[PDB]
Design a protein around this ligand. Structure first.
Ligand SMILES: [K+]
Ligand SMILES: [K+]
Ligand SMILES: [K+]
Ligand SMILES: [K+]
Lengths: 256, 256
C-alpha cells in the first residue's frame, strides 16, 4: 500500500525491463524523484543522466551555460524513463532570470534516417507537447507566438495559459499536467489554465497554426498529430534550454 | 542611468581596451550611432573608417561606386567594434534604386594563411549572418536564390523573410535583429519575419544547404556552424555592396 513497482528503461528505445519501488501516497501520487538520486531518470536518447543535471537541496537542477536550444556541453533533455498513458503530474518549478525550460509529456524517443542511412536523434519537442517554463517578464519568447502562447504553462506555441498567474523569476510555481483518455489540462499555481483534447480535429487545427505544422515541420506534425504513438503513451521530462532551472516535489498519479 | 560604458576595439582583432559613454534610454537601448561621429566604428579588418563611409544628414552613409562585391576604392564593410552576445539591434535603413547592402551580426574578424604563410583577411560574411538590405523590386538578386531568400530582411540565401513587407527604394525600413541565447529573430517594419536557432542540427542543416556548406566552403562552414566563436559573440556591422545606402537610429539593447 505504501510503495508501488514502477518499470523503467535504461537506454534509447529499450524495454522497461527493470522496476523501482517508489513511494505512493493515500491518493495514488507516486513520488518519482526521491530528492537524492536519479533512479529511473536518464537523458532523452541516452543511457545516463547528463552531468549538467544535478541534485541540489532536494531538487533536480539543470546547470545552464546560456545557448538556448544548442544543448552544448554534457546536456540534453531529461526524462523519467517510464511511459505513462493516463496520469496526473504535479511538480514545482523555478526558473532563473531570463530563463527558459519546459515540462514535456507523452514524449517518444525518435530517430530519423539521413541521406546516407545514419540515425539522427530528433528533438523531444517534435513528439512531446510542452508545458512551457519561462521568465515571462525577461525572456523574449514571452512576446513571440500569439496571444502569449509561449508564456509559462502554455501548450507551447498553441494554447496560452489563461489566467497567466505565474510568479516571477526565482520564485516557485506549481505545475499540473493531466492527461486522461485524450483530455489534457495544464494547471499553474493551483488554477486550471487550459484544456484541450488530443487526436481530434481541434488538435490537428492547433498543430497546423503552430511551428509544428505539416508545412513547416512535416515529421513534427506526424508525430504530434498521433501524439504518444500507436499506444498513446510516453515519457514525462524536462528541457535543457541552456538556463538554470529547478524542479522539485515531482509526483505522478496513474489514472489508467 | 542616462549613460553606459561601452567598450570598443581600435584595430584588427584587438582587445576592447577603451570605452565610450553612450546614452541609454529607459528601455535599455544604447544609442551606438550619435548622428555626428564614427566613435567606436571602424572598417572590418581596419583601424579607421573607410572614406566611402560618411555621415550625411544624421545617417551613416555608404557612397557606392557600383561594383557590387568588388569593394573597390576605399570601401569595405563597417563594424561597430563592440562584441555583443545577447542583444536586440534596431536600426533604420534606406537604399538607392536597385541598391544592395546588409546588416551583419555576430561577426568575427578572421584571417587565414596563404600557401606562403602570409595573412589573408577573410570576408565578414563567412562568419557573420547577414540580414539582407535590398531594393526587392529592382536588384536582380531579389529573383535569385530560393523562395525569395535573398530579399530584404532574409537571412541571406538561407531563410526568407515572411511576410516580405519591405518599403520600396528611397523609403525608410525598420530592421530588428534579436539574438537571445541562440534564438534569432529578424524583424522588418514592426513584424517578425523569421526565427531560427543557432548551434542546433537545424542550423547545421541550413548551412549544409547553403553556399557556406561544408563541401563548398569549409572555413565558412566551421565559423558559421559555431557562430560567434567560442564565446558566441561578435560585431554588428553593415555591408559595402557597392551601392548608396543610409542607416540611422542605430540602437542596441543588451538583453542578458
Ligand atoms: K539514472
Ligand atoms: K521551453
Ligand atoms: K572611429
Ligand atoms: K547584401
Amino acid at each position: 500500500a505504501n510503495e508501488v513497482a514502477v518499470s523503467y528503461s535504461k537506454s534509447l528505445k529499450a524495454a522497461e525491463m527493470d522496476s523501482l519501488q517508489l513511494p505512493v501516497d493515500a491518493d495514488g501520487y507516486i513520488t518519482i524523484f526521491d530528492g537524492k538520486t536519479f533512479n529511473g531518470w536518464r537523458g532523452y536518447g541516452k543511457d545516463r543522466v547528463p552531468s549538467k543535471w544535478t541534485i541540489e537541496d532536494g531538487c533536480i537542477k539543470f546547470n545552464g551555460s546560456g545557448g538556448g536550444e544548442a544543448q552544448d556541453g554534457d546536456g540534453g533533455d531529461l526524462i523519467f524513463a517510464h511511459k505513462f498513458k493516463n496520469f496526473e503530474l504535479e511538480m514545482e518549478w523555478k526558473v532563473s532570470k531570463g530563463g527558459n525550460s519546459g515540462i514535456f509529456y507523452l514524449a517518444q524517443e525518435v530517430t530519423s534516417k539521413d541521406k546516407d542511412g545514419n540515425d539522427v536523434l530528433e528533438p523531444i519537442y517534435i513528439s512531446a507537447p510542452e508545458y512551457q517554463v519561462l521568465d515571462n517578464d525577461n525572456h523574449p519568447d514571452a512576446k513571440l507566438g500569439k496571444d502569449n502562447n509561449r508564456q509559462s504553462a502554455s501548450l507551447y506555441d498553441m494554447i496560452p495559459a489563461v489566467p497567466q498567474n505565474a510568479k516571477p523569476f526565482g520564485e516557485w510555481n506549481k505545475a499540473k499536467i493531466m492527461v486522461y483518455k485524450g483530455t489534457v489540462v495544464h494547471g499553474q499555481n493551483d488554477e486550471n489554465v487550459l484544456e484541450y483534447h488530443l487526436w481530434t480535429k481541434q488538435w490537428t487545427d492547433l498543430l497546423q497554426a503552430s511551428k509544428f505544422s505539416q508545412d513547416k515541420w512535416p515529421l513534427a506534425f506526424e508525430l504530434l498529430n498521433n501524439c504518444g504513438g500507436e499506444n498513446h503513451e510516453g515519457f514525462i521530462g524536462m528541457q535543457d534550454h541552456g538556463d538554470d532551472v529547478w524542479f522539485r516535489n515531482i509526483r505522478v498519479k496513474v489514472l489508467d
